[PDB]
Amino acid sequence: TPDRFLYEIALTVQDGSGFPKLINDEEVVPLNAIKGCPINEALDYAISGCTETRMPNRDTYTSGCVYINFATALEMLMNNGRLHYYGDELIGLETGDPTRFQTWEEFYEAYKAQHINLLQKAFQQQHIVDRLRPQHFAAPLSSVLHNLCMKNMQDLHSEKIEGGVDYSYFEFLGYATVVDSLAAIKKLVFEEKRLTMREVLDAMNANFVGYEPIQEMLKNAPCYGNNDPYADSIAKDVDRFTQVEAEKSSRDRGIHVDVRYVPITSHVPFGKIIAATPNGRVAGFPLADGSSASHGADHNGPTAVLLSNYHSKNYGMINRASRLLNIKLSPKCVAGEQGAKKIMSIIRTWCDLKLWHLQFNIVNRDTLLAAQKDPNSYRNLIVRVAGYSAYFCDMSPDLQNDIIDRTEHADL
């Protein structure tokens, strides 16, 4: 990318309206080409929707794909396959009383069972969707504009179009919530034995009311997004064994089944049905979205967040698609010429690390809270929330607080 153009990008980021979003050719093009797209068409890709990459005369797959609330796997492990929001209904696996687990290894294997049970049902749900959509949906205009539809004389929403590449997805919501919760239990319950499982459960059941010291201790256990391998290695294994299942589903369905971390606003409703969690998040609060750090858990600057992303990925596999990655910077940290060069440098690092997506948020915490009190004076406040640009003052409290409660990196 030329320096002159990257500088123009940095200046747009500095303007503070949340544009542009960034997508990384060095991750996207080899993945799509390895998966079957001719290299020249892959190099010609269009960004589509939030972070996706379309080859308009090669892409053939169009089914809206399953969204998985993986925080439910965590809670169901803590609750014998139940979710408190649903009472005694058996939703997942009956992995038993969590105070019975003797070792981390046993506890983690039970997490995997819950997690894989959700994947198995998600893949089944999606395959049925793939089978049903062609009976309800057509797109004759999109088809006439599509080389392969015209060559094969098939509508784009046909299941299989010869020559096409079918990029399908399944969504991972709550990544950092799960990782941090598992890290907190591994560190404090099983390794240092500073806490028993019972104590963590009682604290969670109280929404940490009266258990603030336990909450503080869980929150200080190692967290994703700090380039701390204690947690990032958990994130990496979770992403890895998810892709192991996805490779099998790809073989059985004849399409690419790739894990994706594009939350839209799903982390709000997904968070509403999840009780307090072992990372110190309180009940009903939004889940961690995309592959960003859990709210306020990243305390080592933005490069550390990029490195946690890099080290939690599995680059010797291919069953991955987008990761939505947001980092909030204080405007003082990026002001003027020197600040633009710092934005440029972060972007070059993110590119070298082969991360898919990057979005900067440049906003002061005082500006945000000030706009909650006196909206009329901040009607020009454009921010990024759940991936899309919005007027902060038009946003719901759920989403305002989503943005407010993210770390504001100051030392850039």
Partner 1 sequence: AKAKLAGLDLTNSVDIWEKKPFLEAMIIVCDAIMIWAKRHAQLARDTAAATSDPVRKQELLRMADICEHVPAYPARNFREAVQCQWFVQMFSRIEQKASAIISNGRMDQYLYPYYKKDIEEGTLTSEEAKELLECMWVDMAQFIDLYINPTGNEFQEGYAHWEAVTVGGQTPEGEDATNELSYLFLESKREFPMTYPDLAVRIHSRTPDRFLYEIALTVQDGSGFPKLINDEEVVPLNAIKGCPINEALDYAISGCTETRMPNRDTYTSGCVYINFATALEMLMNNGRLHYYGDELIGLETGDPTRFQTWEEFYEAYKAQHINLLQKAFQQQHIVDRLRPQHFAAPLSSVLHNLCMKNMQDLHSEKIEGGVDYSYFEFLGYATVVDSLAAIKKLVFEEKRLTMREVLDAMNA
Q: Which of 148, 153, 191 is nearest to 60 (CA)?
A: 148
If contact means CB under 5 to 8 A according to the sort of partner, which of Na ion, partner 1, none does residue 60 touch? Na ion
Which C-beta is closer to partner 1: that of 191 or that of 252?
Answer: 252
Instruction: State the Cα angle at 162 between 129 and 127, rounded to 5°.
Output: 15
Residue burial 53-63, b: 16+ Cβ < 10 Å; e: rest:
bebebbbbbbb
Is 247 flagged in the annotation as binding?
no
Residue 65 in marked binding region: no
Nearest residue to 176 (alpha-carbon basis) of 33, 316, 309 = 309
Distance of alpha carbon 163 from alpha carbon 59, whole angstroms: 9
Contact between 347 and 6 under an 8 Å Cβ cutoff? The reply is yes
Which CB, 117 or 330, lies closer to partner 1?
Answer: 117
Closest approach, Cβ 239 to partner 1, in A, equals: 12
The annotation status of 365 as a binding-site residue, yes or no, is no
Residue 156 or 355: the one with the smaller Cβ distance to partner 1 is: 355
> Does position 252 bind partner 1 by CB under 8 A?
yes
The 3-state DSSP class for residue 141 equals helix
Which part of the chain contacts partner 1 (CB under 8 A), choosing from 9-17, 52-60, 201-209, 351-359? 351-359
* Partners of residue 326 on adjacent β-strands: 359
Q: Which residues bind Na ion (CB under 5 A)?
A: 60, 158
State which residue has the least CB distance to Na ion: 60
| Minimum CB distance to partner 1 smaller for 238 or for 329 | 238
Does position 30 interact with partner 1 (CB under 8 A)? The reply is yes
Calpha distance 105→107 (Å, rounded): 5
Q: Is 90 in the site for partner 1 (CB under 8 A)?
A: no
State both tokens at 144.
């006439």
Which residues are near partner 1 by CB under 8 A? 26, 29-30, 33-34, 39, 120, 123-124, 126-128, 131, 248-249, 252-253, 257, 311, 313-318, 352-354
Binding residues for (2S)-3-sulfopropanediol: 50, 52, 260
